[PDB]
Design a protein around this nucleic acid. Structure first.
Lengths: 26, 49, 154, 192, 41, 152, 254, 265
RNA sequence: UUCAACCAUCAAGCCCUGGGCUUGUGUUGGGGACCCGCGGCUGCUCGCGGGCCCUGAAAAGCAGUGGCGGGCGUGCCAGCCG
């Protein structure tokens, strides 16, 4: 637990940081 | 005012049977169905609301 | 056939002297492949995840609802890996994902995401923590009913 | 069990058909056409169903000949979503009358196996043979109404029935409304 | 009856949530012996 | 036994009285039904109340059709308890809500010929409307003359 | 196996793949030809063209009968059109070679007797009316016979046209056929006495007269100027009945 | 309708607007429309007409550089976009902020929030007459509840089967398109509704009273001549007002009846 | 047990050679301030129509007016008009 409304709903995630295997190009 | 008589398709079929290229058979309007039993699916049995 | 046609158009464009991006547009496709989908979920690029209910072995997808819950991704369990394979032009698919769609379908994607949330995840919020199985056989249930009736009568 | 999406779709179809019929009635405003009854929406409004019953197009794959007047053009415009209509040529008319030609005597359907039937039923109008019938239908003579009322509606076949993977598929897909002009003849060739 | 009304409601809910293909054909077997099917050779 | 009242909302366009009755008659017998509509237009306000004869039938139908995605609308189906169901909830239920052209009534009412006594009342209330607008224009800094309105 | 693949593609929703696989099926409803090719079977069954000419009686009777039938699943409409095409090509060969000898009008139909390479060929053609398909016949095995006989008649027509030095298949006009040319839609082109009995006459056929047998007989026995009523179709020498060049008129009205 | 009374009405209204805005002041004075109000004895139209009528002005409106213009054309949008980028003058190229055809409009702006975003993103909407009958369903009540930003009809079809948009556009010449676009942008708009009232935007507060008087005179002349049924014996009242000011009368009628056929004892 | 598209992507008519004019009726529901025009209401106010904002295709009684026919005087019309 811790533009458009369609954009907000599609892009809404949680506050946990992303996990990356490696640094990706670009 | 000519009245054409007979059936030429029947004549050709009779000619085939008489000359012996094929034997005379009768039409089967209904064939026997496979003997089966109706039962309800497991998901529809286990559906609960 | 579509890929061969696109490659022919791009080869024509290169031969006449423009980049392939001048003739080809940015694609929008269903993302699939288990490792690819898990990577997208970890990078938080997936907007919606659909996981097949009959993956054997189950260990390939048993962590996926917990991963989606941690990453904040909406997920739904759906019947048919063959049904997902019909989407991805394969025999079977273990999991599919949407990261982004076109502007004429972004509203439909948002409506589907909200519908999946309110009508699936809120309903399975409590039942996902319960133990399954434990169902008795027919004759065992009849014997249990008979002995409970005998105990109640006596 | 009938689903709510089917209910909403039927309501929207009925409202759209009501709007279209009202627009036709507000706007208001001699060739030969062949009309084939195809599959449309399930619920038909009373005026289109009355026109279909008058034109004897109640069953699917039924074909009739219509003389184009102002009135018949209005009825055709009314029942456009359920029919496919066009201009039949001489080969189409001749093949339809010779191969699938049935006449109506006393309410019964009798195939046109001989010219004496045509002479007995339409001989008072000068039509004494099946070729006289074809001439009247194709040229749209003074006795076109009598000839078309003598002719039974044509029961056309489904070419998709001969192939098992496409056995349930209807031959004519709805959506291409309006006059097909000379392109009804391909459908006549395939279905006759 | 109340049981009939409840059964009608359950049937309607089942049709709404799952569909109408609730039943399946199974073969009637007069014998308890299973044989290998005859295939193309 | 106990009546069951279900409130349904997020109605898509076309999911109206007859459609609702036909769809939920599959679930159970409906005694009353009313879609909330605007009296100035006749358009639906995307909500309705259905009163089934059986409370458990209503409850099953509400749990079945709650959060149902229909034509882009996620339906909201809830069971109202008998405590706060309004006694005057189903007035005008089970009958057609007629659409009335109030604008056409007003236009043809002003187009209707009418009599000289109410013409004098008409024109008179028009001059004190003129006088009210004139005394509003006094502090406006504006002066408008008015022609002498003739009477028949 | 191909039908199973088409069913799999349709079940998976690959409509383009299903259409591409259905193109390999060679369906009679699309091609007008039999589903399977019987070219080797023709050579196996008829060792000699004389044997083919001797079986042309049954072949021609079957094909002239089936050229006037409604479309069915066993014999589709394009297949019926191909039967009519082959019959018209054979009639054009008989006309150009003057091989027609005798004709008869029985109560059953029109009998024709020709002489091709010393073989007497007699066959029966129904009157142009509605032919009744009754349940006492096996229509599907009749359709198999029709497929075999059209495969035979194509090769027979090719050999006859090549023997008389003409291009096979003849040029065919779709527009004229749509207007109703029938026999008149064929243009016979070069490759790379009872015959002149109606040579000097001009005939006009009224619409109540049998146009196809009358045209076939007159053109086979030497008439080069046959006009008819306008509704009988395109290809008449003249259309108006008031043409002074007309010598004979065929009528059947009281 | 005497023009001196109209001129002193514009003078009084502008003085009122400035003294009200004094109590940024010039920004508040700017973007303040002037509305001419027509009151008629009967309904001007028997039904709602959703296509505005154009009245040509000696002093055209929307001449500011910040006005964004959205142009809706028939398919394809690529030809019209190329005409925008290549063969239009610079002022119209800067003014036109978006070109979108009817198919893309129906694809992308079916949602009400998308319609409201498109409504907010532009000020003047122009629409080809070939597709303007389909725009009420495509844009909804978002564009047609308020008559301010209704699509103005423009003629782009070249004056004389199914047309394929890729092979042909069926368009009139580009200078004619330029002239039509400029004329429709500058033209005042009249909206026909089943009402006794009609409001027309004739100018802004920063304009000159002579310009307002001339614009009011020409729109009164053309609108009574063309759009008012039964000419001058249907016109009841004329007013000039602002968004918050009162209504200053211009011409008030003497006969309050429609004609003598309403007279019955 | 199919939630797709499907109006006019221009036609018809006027001036009679200028490229212009007319018709082709097609809008989700709510909420907040507030300037007005016109009907009633003794009047407040209630109606019709505009002006300014807000909104996921959002929603929790307040339903209101005279009739032709049809169904059995009518909280009935998948029929209409006033």
């Amino acid at each position: 637990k811790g533009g458009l409304k369609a954009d907000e709903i599609i892009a809404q995630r949680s506050a946990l940081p992303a996990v990356s295997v490696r640094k990706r190009a670009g | 005012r000519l009245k054409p008589e007979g059936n030429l398709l029947k004549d050709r079929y009779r000619s085939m049977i008489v000359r012996g290229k094929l034997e005379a058979r009768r039409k089967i309007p209904f064939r026997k169905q496979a003997k089966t039993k109706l039962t309800e699916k497991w998901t529809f049995k286990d559906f609960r609301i | 056939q579509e890929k061969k046609e696109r490659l022919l158009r791009e080869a024509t464009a290169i031969k006449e002297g423009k980049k392939k991006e001048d003739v080809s547009k940015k694609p929008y496709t269903v993302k699939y492949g288990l490792n690819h989908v898990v990577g997208l979920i970890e990078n938080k690029k997936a907007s919606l995840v659909l996981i097949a209910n009959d993956v054997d072995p189950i260990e390939l997808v048993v962590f996926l609802p917990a991963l989606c819950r941690k990453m904040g991704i909406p997920y739904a369990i759906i019947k048919g890996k063959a049904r997902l394979g019909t989407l991805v032009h394969k025999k079977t698919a273990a999991v599919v994902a949407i990261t982004e769609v076109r502007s004429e379908d972004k509203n439909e994607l948002a409506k589907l995401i909200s519908a999946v949330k309110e009508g699936y995840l809120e309903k399975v919020e409590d039942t996902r923590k319960r133990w399954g199985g434990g169902i008795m056989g027919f004759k065992a249930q009849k014997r249990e009913e008979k002995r409970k009736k005998s105990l109640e009568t006596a | 069990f009938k689903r709510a999406e089917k209910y909403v779709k039927e309501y929207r179809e009925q409202e759209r058909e009501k709007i279209r019929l009202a627009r036709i009635a507000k706007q208001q405003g001699a060739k030969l056409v062949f009309v084939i009854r195809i599959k449309g929406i399930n619920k038909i409004p009373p005026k289109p169903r009355k026109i279909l019953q008058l034109l004897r197009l109640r069953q699917i794959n039924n074909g009739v000949f219509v003389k184009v007047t102002k009135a018949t053009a209005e009825m055709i415009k009314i029942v456009e979503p359920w029919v496919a209509y066009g201009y039949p040529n001489l080969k189409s008319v001749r093949e339809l009358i010779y191969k699938r030609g049935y006449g109506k005597v006393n309410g019964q359907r009798i195939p046109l196996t001989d010219n004496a039937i045509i002479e007995e039923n339409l001989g008072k109008y000068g039509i004494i043979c099946i070729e006289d019938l074809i001439h009247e239908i194709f040229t749209v003579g003074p006795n076109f109404k009598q000839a078309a009322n003598f002719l039974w509606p044509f029961k056309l076949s489904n070419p998709n029935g001969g192939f098992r993977p496409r056995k349930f598929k209807h031959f004519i897909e709805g959506g291409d409304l309006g006059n097909r002009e000379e392109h009804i003849n391909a459908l006549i060739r395939a279905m006759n | 009856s109340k049981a009939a009304k409840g059964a009608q409601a359950k049937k309607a809910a089942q049709a709404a949530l799952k569909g109408v293909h609730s039943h399946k054909k199974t073969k009637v077997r007069k014998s308890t012996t299973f044989h290998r099917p005859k295939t193309l050779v | 036994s106990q009546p069951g009242v279900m409130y349904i909302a997020r109605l898509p366009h076309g999911f109206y009285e007859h459609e609702l009755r036909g769809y939920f008659s599959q679930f159970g017998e409906i005694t009353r039904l009313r879609v909330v509509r605007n009296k100035k237009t006749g358009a639906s306000r995307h909500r309705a109340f259905i009163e089934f004869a059986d409370a458990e039938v209503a409850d099953i139908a509400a749990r079945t059709m709650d959060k149902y995605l229909l034509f882009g609308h996620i339906l909201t189906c809830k069971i109202v308890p008998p405590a706060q169901v309004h006694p005057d909830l189903f007035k005008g239920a089970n009958r057609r809500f007629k659409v009335v052209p109030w604008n056409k009534m007003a236009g043809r009412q002003l187009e209707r010929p009418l009599s000289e006594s109410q013409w004098q009342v008409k024109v008179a209330k028009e001059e004190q409307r003129r006088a009210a607008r004139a005394e509003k224009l006094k502090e406006m800094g504006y002066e408008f003359e008015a022609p002498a309105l003739k009477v028949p | 196996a191909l039908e199973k693949k088409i069913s799999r593609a349709l079940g998976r929703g690959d409509v383009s793949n299903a259409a591409r696989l259905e193109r390999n099926a060679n369906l009679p409803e699309k091609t007008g030809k039999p589903r399977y090719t019987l070219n080797h079977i023709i050579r196996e069954r008829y060792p000699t063209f004389q044997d083919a000419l001797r079986d042309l009686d049954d072949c021609l009777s079957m094909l002239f009968l089936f050229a006037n039938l409604p479309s069915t699943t066993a014999v589709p409409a394009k297949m019926i059109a191909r039967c009519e095409r082959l019959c018209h090509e054979f009639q054009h060969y008989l006309i150009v070679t003057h091989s027609l000898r005798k004709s008869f009008l029985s109560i059953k139909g029109i009998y024709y007797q020709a002489n091709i390479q010393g073989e007497d060929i007699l066959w029966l053609v129904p009157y142009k009316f509605n032919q009744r398909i009754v349940g006492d016949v096996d229509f599907r095995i009749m359709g198999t016979f029709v497929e075999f006989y059209m495969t035979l008649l194509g090769f027979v027509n090719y050999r006859l046209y090549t023997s008389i030095g003409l291009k096979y298949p003849p040029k065919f006009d779709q527009v004229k056929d749509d207007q109703g040319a029938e026999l008149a839609a064929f243009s016979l082109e070069g490759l790379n006495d009872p015959s002149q009995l109606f040579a000097n006459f001009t005939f006009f056929l009224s619409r109540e007269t049998p146009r196809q047998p009358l045209e076939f007989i007159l053109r086979a026995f030497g008439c080069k100027r046959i006009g008819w009523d306008a509704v009988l179709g395109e290809g008449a020498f003249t259309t108006d009945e008031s043409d002074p060049r007309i010598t004979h008129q065929i009528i059947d009205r009281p | 309708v005497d023009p001196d009374q109209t001129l002193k009405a514009c003078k009084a209204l502008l003085a009122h607007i400035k003294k009200a805005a004094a109590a940024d002041e010039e920004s508040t004075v700017a973007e303040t429309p002037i509305w001419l109000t027509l009151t008629t004895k009967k309904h001007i139209h028997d039904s709602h007409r959703l296509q505005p009528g154009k009245i040509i002005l000696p002093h055209p409106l929307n001449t500011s550089e910040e006005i964004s213009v959205c142009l809706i054309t028939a398919d394809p949008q690529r030809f019209y976009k190329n005409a925008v980028a290549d063969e239009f003058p610079e002022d119209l190229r800067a003014k036109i902020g978006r070109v979108i055809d009817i198919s893309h409009l129906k694809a992308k702006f079916k949602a009400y929030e998308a319609q409201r975003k498109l409504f907010s993103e532009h000020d003047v909407f122009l629409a080809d007459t070939r597709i303007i009958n389909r725009l009420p369903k495509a844009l909804g009540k978002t564009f047609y509840k308020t008559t301010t930003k209704r699509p103005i009809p423009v003629v782009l079809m070249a004056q004389r089967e199914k047309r394929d948009p890729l092979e042909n556009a069926n368009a009139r010449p580009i200078p004619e398109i330029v002239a039509e676009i400029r004329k429709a942008i500058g033209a005042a708009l009249v909206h026909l509704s089943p009402s006794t009232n009609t409001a027309i935007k004739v100018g802004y507060a920063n304009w000159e009273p002579e310009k307002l008087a001339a614009n009011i005179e020409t729109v009164i002349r053309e609108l009574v001549e063309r759009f008012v049924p039964q000419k001058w014996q249907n016109v009841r009242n004329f007013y000039v007002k602002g968004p918050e000011t009162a209504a200053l009368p211009i011409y008030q009628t003497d006969e309050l009846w429609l004609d003598e056929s309403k007279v019955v004892p």
